[PDB]
Amino acid sequence: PWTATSGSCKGRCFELQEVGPPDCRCDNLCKSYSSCCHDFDELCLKTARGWECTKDRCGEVRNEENACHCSEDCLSRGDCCTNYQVVCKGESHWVDDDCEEIKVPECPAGFVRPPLIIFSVDGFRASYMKKGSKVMPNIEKLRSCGTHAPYMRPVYPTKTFPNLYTLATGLYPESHGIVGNSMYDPVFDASFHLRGREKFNHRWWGGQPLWITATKQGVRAGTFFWSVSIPHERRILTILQWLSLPDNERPSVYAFYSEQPDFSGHKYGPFGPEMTNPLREIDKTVGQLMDGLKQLRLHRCVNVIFVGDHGMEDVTCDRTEFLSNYLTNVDDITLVPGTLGRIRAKSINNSKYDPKTIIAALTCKKPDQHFKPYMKQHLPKRLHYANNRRIEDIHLLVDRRWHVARKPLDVYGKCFFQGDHGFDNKVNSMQTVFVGYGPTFKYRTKVPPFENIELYNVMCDLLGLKPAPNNGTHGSLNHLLRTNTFRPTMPDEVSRPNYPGIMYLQSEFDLGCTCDDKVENKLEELNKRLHTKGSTKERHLLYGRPAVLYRTSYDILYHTDFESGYSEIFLMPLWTSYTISKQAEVSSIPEHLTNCVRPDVRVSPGFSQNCLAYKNDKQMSYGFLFPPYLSSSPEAKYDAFLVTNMVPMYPAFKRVWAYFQRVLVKKYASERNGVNVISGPIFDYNYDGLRDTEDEIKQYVEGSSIPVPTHYYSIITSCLDFTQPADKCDGPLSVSSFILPHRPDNDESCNSSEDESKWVEELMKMHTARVRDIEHLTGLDFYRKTSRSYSEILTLKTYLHTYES
Numbered sequence: 001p002w003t004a005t006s007g008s009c010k011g012r013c014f015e016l017q018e019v020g021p022p023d024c025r026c027d028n029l030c031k032s033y034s035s036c037c038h039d040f041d042e043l044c045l046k047t048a049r050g051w052e053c054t055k056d057r058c059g060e061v062r063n064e065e066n067a068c069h070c071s072e073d074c075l076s077r078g079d080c081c082t083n084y085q086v087v088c089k090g091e092s093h094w095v096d097d098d099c100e101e102i103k104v105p106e107c108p109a110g111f112v113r114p115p116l117i118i119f120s121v122d123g124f125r126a127s128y129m130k131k132g133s134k135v136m137p138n139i140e141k142l143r144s145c146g147t148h149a150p151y152m153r154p155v156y157p158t159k160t161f162p163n164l165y166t167l168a169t170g171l172y173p174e175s176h177g178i179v180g181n182s183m184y185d186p187v188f189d190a191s192f193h194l195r196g197r198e199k200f201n202h203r204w205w206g207g208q209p210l211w212i213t214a215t216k217q218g219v220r221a222g223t224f225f226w227s228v229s230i231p232h233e234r235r236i237l238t239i240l241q242w243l244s245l246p247d248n249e250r251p252s253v254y255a256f257y258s259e260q261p262d263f264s265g266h267k268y269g270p271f272g273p274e275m276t277n278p279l280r281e282i283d284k285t286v287g288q289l290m291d292g293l294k295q296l297r298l299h300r301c302v303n304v305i306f307v308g309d310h311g312m313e314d315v316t317c318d319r320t321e322f323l324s325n326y327l328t329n330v331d332d333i334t335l336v337p338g339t340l341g342r343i344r345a346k347s348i349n350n351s352k353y354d355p356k357t358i359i360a361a362l363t364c365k366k367p368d369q370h371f372k373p374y375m376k377q378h379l380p381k382r383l384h385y386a387n388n389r390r391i392e393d394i395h396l397l398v399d400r401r402w403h404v405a406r407k408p409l410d411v412y413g414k415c416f417f418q419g420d421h422g423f424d425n426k427v428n429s430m431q432t433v434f435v436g437y438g439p440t441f442k443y444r445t446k447v448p449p450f451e452n453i454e455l456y457n458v459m460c461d462l463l464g465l466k467p468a469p470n471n472g473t474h475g476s477l478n479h480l481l482r483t484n485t486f487r488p489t490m491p492d493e494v495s496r497p498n499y500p501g502i503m504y505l506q507s508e509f510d511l512g513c514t515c516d517d518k519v520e521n522k523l524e525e526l527n528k529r530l531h532t533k534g535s536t537k538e539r540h541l542l543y544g545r546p547a548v549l550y551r552t553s554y555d556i557l558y559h560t561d562f563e564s565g566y567s568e569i570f571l572m573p574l575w576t577s578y579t580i581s582k583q584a585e586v587s588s589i590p591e592h593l594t595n596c597v598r599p600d601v602r603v604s605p606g607f608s609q610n611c612l613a614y615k616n617d618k619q620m621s622y623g624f625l626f627p628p629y630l631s632s633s634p635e636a637k638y639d640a641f642l643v644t645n646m647v648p649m650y651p652a653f654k655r656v657w658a659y660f661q662r663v664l665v666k667k668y669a670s671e672r673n674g675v676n677v678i679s680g681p682i683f684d685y686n687y688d689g690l691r692d693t694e695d696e697i698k699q700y701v702e703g704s705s706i707p708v709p710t711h712y713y714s715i716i717t718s719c720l721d722f723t724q725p726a727d728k729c730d731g732p733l734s735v736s737s738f739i740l741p742h743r744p745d746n747d748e749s750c751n752s753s754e755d756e757s758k759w760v761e762e763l764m765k766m767h768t769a770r771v772r773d774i775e776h777l778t779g780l781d782f783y784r785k786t787s788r789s790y791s792e793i794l795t796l797k798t799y800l801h802t803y804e805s
C-alpha cells in the first residue's frame with residue numbers, strides 16, 4: 001500500500017516502534033515494507049570511513065558523516081567503532097582475553113535483569129563447530145567457555161521459516177502454522193511464499209512469539225528483524241547503541257540474524273572450499289559484538305545465545321526423483337517439491353483424483369527409490385507433522401542428498417545449487433548449533449543434544465517471563481543454567497486405580513477361544529496368590545506405576561512376570577510393565593497355550609475382549625503386550641495368555657511385533673545389562689499427537705466394542721552405567737522408545753517380503769520416539785518414583801535415540 005516518504009528520519013534512526021501510514025518509517029524493518037523516509041539511507045546507513053578505527057582517527061573531532069566514531073565522546077554516546085578501545089586505548093580484543101567464570105551479572109547500575117542477545121545463523125550445521133574451529137576463534141571462545149551442546153535438533157521440515165518460528169514460539173510447525181517455506185491454506189485460499197508480501201499478513205503466524213510474550217509482561221523487546229540490505233556491521237552497531245539507551249527505553253532482549261552460512265551453503269555445498277570465508281566473516285561479526293560489549297562494560301552482563309535454524313546437506317540436481325516417472329496423471333497434481341514433497345489435487349473439481357491410487361503408484365516402484373510416500377497420519381509421530389490444514393494429506397519423505405520434483409523441466413532450478421536442507425530432523429546433516437554464554441548459563445559446560453522446541457522456555461527463564469503454552473518440557477533444560485531454573489511439580493494423578501481380586505468364575509465367560517487349562521501343592525499355591533497380590537511388583541515396576549492424568553476407570557493387575565494398568569473402557573491395558581534380565585531365557589509357546597486365551601477372573605466378562613470377534617474379523621488378529629516368549633516359568637506362562645494381556649493386531653503388524661518381542665527384547669537385555677519395558681496401545685485417529693477420547697475412535701474389531709489402536713509403543717529403560725543391572729541401578733538412567741504404526745500392511749517397508757531380520761529394525765528406527773511423545777499420546781506420566789532429580793527425569797523424557805552415526 002502507498003506511504004508518504006516525504007518526511008524525515010532525523011533523530012529517529014532505528015527507532016524502537018513502528019510508526020503508521022501518517023508517517024514514513026525509520027525502524028530496522030522499514031525497507032522490507034518499502035516505507036522508509038527518503039532520508040533513511042543518508043542518516044541511518046552511514047558508511048564513511050568503514051567499520052574500524054585506525055590510529056590516525058584516535059581522538060578525532062566527531063564528524064557525524066562517519067559510520068562509527070573514534071572521538072573521545074564515543075563511549076558515552078555509545079557509537080564508537082567496536083575496535084575503538086583496542087586501537088586507541090591499548091585494550092585487548094575480547095577473543096584474546098582468558099576466559100574467567102561469570103558468577104553473577106556484572107552490569108551497570110540501572111539494569112534490572114541481564115539482557116539477552118540471540119545471535120541466529122542460518123544453515124549453520126552442527127559439525128561446523130569442530131570443522132571450522134581454526135577460522136572461528138570468537139565462536140570457539142563462546143563455545144568452550146560457556147554452555148554448549150554437541151548439536152541441537154531442528155524441527156521437521158528442516159527449513160528456515162518453520163525453524164525460526166519454532167525458536168520464537170516453542171511450538172511444532174503443525175501448531176504455530178508455519179509448516180513450510182511455501183504453503184497453501186485452503187481456508188483462506190491464500191499462498192505463503194519466501195518471495196512476496198503474503199508472508200507479512202498476521203493470519204499465518206500462530207502461537208505467541210518471544211517478542212510478544214516479553215511485551216505483554218512488561219519486558220521491552222528489540223526490533224528482532226532486519227531488512228536484508230542492512231549490513232551486519234550496522235546491525236551490530238545498532239544493538240550496541242540500543243544497549244546504551246536509558247533504563248526506561250533500553251530493550252532487555254535483542255536478536256541478530258545472519259543469512260550466512262546458508263546462502264553460500266546452497267551454492268557450494270556444506271563443505272565446499274568457498275565455505276571458509278563465510279565462516280570467517282560470521283566469526284568476525286561475533287568478535288565485533290563481543291569487543292563492542294566489552295567497551296560498554298557489558299561483556300560479563302549480557303547472556304548471548306548462538307543458535308542455528310538447521311544444517312545443510314549435499315544435494316545436486318542429478319539426485320532428483322521425478323513424479324512424471326511414476327504418475328501417468330502427473331498434470332492433475334500440485335507438488336510442493338524439493339527436500340520434502342507435499343501433494344494435493346491441482347483442481348478440487350477433479351472427481352477422478354484419488355489419493356489411494358497416487359500413493360500406490362509411488363510405493364516401492366524402483367529398486368533404490370529415493371523418497372517414500374505417506375498419508376500424513378502415517379508419518380513417524382516424532383515429526384509431529386500432521387495436525388494442520390496447511391499440511392497436505394500426501395507427503396513424500398525424501399532421502400538425504402536428494403530432491404523430488406514433478407517433471408524434469410522444473411529442475412532447469414536445483415542444478416545451479418550444491419546444497420539444501422529440509423529432510424527428516426534426525427538426519428545428522430540437518431543438525432545445528434547451540435551455545436549459551438553469560439552469567440545465567442553455566443561455565444565450561446557441555447550438555448547433551450536437545451531439541452530446538454525447548455529453547456523458548458529457556459529464553460523466557462532468562463528474561464523472567466512466563467512462557468505461553470508450548471511444546472517444550474519446561475525444566476528439561478535446567479542443566480544448562482546457573483540460576484533462574486524452573487522447578488515444576490509432577491502432574492497430579494487424576495484417576496486412581498482399582499485393585500480387583502478374584503471375583504468371577506470361569507463359566508461366566510464365553511470367550512470363544514478358551515485354552516484347555518489342564519495342569520493343577522501349597523508351597524506354590526500361596527506363591528501364586530502372593531504374585532497376584534503384587535509380591536514381585538518391585539522387580540517389574542522399577543520407577544513406580546505410571547500416573548493416569550485423565551478421568552477413567554482402570555485396574556491394576558499383578559503377575560509374576562509383569563504388571564498392567566487395565567482399562568475397563570478400552571478393554572485392554574493402557575500400559576504393561578516388565579523387566580527382563582541379561583540372563584533371561586526365551587521360550588516358545590506350548591501346545592496347551594496355542595490359539596487360545598484365558599479368562600481373567602479378576603475382570604468381568606463385560607469388561608473383557610473376546611475371541612469370537614477376532615474370528616469373525618477377517619482382517620484383524622491379536623497379539624500380547626507382555627511377551628509370552630519371555631515368561632519366567634511354565635506356571636507364569638499361563639498369565640501371558642490372559643484375555644487382559646491381548647490386544648488387536650493386524651497380521652502384517654504381528655510380524656513386526658513378534659520379531660520385537662521374540663528377538664529384539666532379549667538382544668537389548670543382553671546389550672544393556674537388563675531392560676525394563678513398558679508397552680501399550682495408542683489411539684490417535686485425529687492425528688493431533690494427543691490421546692483420543694473414547695468418542696474419537698474410528699475403528700473397532702468387527703461386531704465388538706474393542707477399539708483398534710493406531711500405534712503400539714514401548715519404552716525401554718536401563719542403567720546409564722551398564723555395569724549395573726537395570727533392576728539395581730544407582731544412578732542416571734538410559735532410555736530408548738518407539739511408537740510403531742499399527743498398519744494392515746507393510747507397504748512402508750519395501751523389503752518386507754524378506755525375513756524380519758532384514759527390515760523390522762529399520763522400521764523401528766524410523767519410528768523412534770521420546771517418552772514425552774508417548775505421554776502426550778496416552779495421558780500417562782512415567783518415572784514417578786525414581787531416586788533422581790525431577791529435572792533430570794524431564795531431560796530423560798525428552799531424549800530421542802536417533803540411531804545416526
Ligand SMILES: *[C@@H]1O[C@H](CO)[C@@H](O[C@@H]2O[C@H](CO)[C@@H](O[C@@H]3O[C@H](CO[C@H]4O[C@H](CO[C@H]5O[C@H](CO)[C@@H](O)[C@H](O)[C@@H]5O)[C@@H](O)[C@H](O[C@H]5O[C@H](CO)[C@@H](O)[C@H](O)[C@@H]5O[C@H]5O[C@H](CO)[C@@H](O)[C@H](O)[C@@H]5O)[C@@H]4O)[C@@H](O)[C@H](O[C@H]4O[C@H](CO)[C@@H](O)[C@H](O)[C@@H]4O[C@H]4O[C@H](CO)[C@@H](O)[C@H](O)[C@@H]4O)[C@@H]3O)[C@H](O)[C@H]2NC(C)=O)[C@H](O)[C@H]1NC(C)=O
Pocket residue numbers: 171172174175176177203204205206207208384387388389468469470471688689690776
Ligand atoms: C503443542 O503445544 C500447543 C500449545 O499448548 C498445543 O496446542 C493446543 O492444543 C489444544 C488442544 O488441541 C488447543 O486447545 C483448543 O483451543 C481452542 C481455542 O483455540 C484458539 O485460541 C487459542 C488461544 O488463543 C488466545 O490465547 C493465546 C495465549 O498465548 C494468545 O496468543 C492468543 O492470541 C489468544 O489470546 C489459540 O492458541 C489457537 O490457535 C490455533 O488456531 C489458530 C487459528 O485461529 C492458528 O493460527 C494457530 O496456529 C493455532 O492452530 C493450531 O491449533 C488448532 C487447534 O486450536 C489446530 O486446529 C491447528 O491445526 C493448529 O494445530 C486458536 O486461535 C478451543 O476452541 C478448543 O476447544 C474445543 O475442544 C475442547 C477440549 O477441551 C472442548 O472441551 C471444547 O468444548 C471445544 O469444543 C468445541 O470446538 C470444537 C473444535 O472446533 C467443536 O468441534 C466442538 O463441537 C465444540 O463446539 C481447544 O481448547 C489449543 O488451541 C492449541 N494451541 C496452539 C497454539 O496450537 C499442542 O497440543 C501441543 N502438541 C502436542 C503434541 O503436545
Ligand SMILES: NS(=O)(=O)C1CCN(C(=O)C2CC3=C(C2)CN(C(=O)c2cc(OCC4CCOCC4)nc(C4CC4)c2)C3)CC1
Pocket residue numbers: 118120122159160161164165167168181194210224225226228255257259262307
Ligand atoms: N533456506 S532458504 O529459505 O532457502 C534461504 C532463502 C533466502 N533467505 C532469506 O531471504 C532470509 C530469510 C530470513 C531473512 C532473509 C530475514 N529473516 C529474519 O529476519 C527472521 C528472523 C527470525 O528470528 C527468529 C528468532 C527467534 C528467537 O530465536 C532465534 C530466531 N524470525 C523470522 C521469522 C520467523 C519469524 C525472520 C529470515 C535465507 C534462507
Ligand SMILES: [Ca+2]
Pocket residue numbers: 122123159160161262309310
Ligand atoms: Ca535457514
Ligand SMILES: [Ca+2]
Pocket residue numbers: 683684685686687688689690691692
Ligand atoms: Ca488424538
Ligand SMILES: [Cl-]
Pocket residue numbers: 157159179180181182183336
Ligand atoms: Cl516447504
Ligand SMILES: [K+]
Pocket residue numbers: 614615616617618619620621
Ligand atoms: K481375525
Ligand code: NA
Pocket residue numbers: 746747748749750751752753
Ligand atoms: Na512391503
Ligand SMILES: [Zn+2]
Pocket residue numbers: 123160262263266421
Ligand atoms: Zn537454506
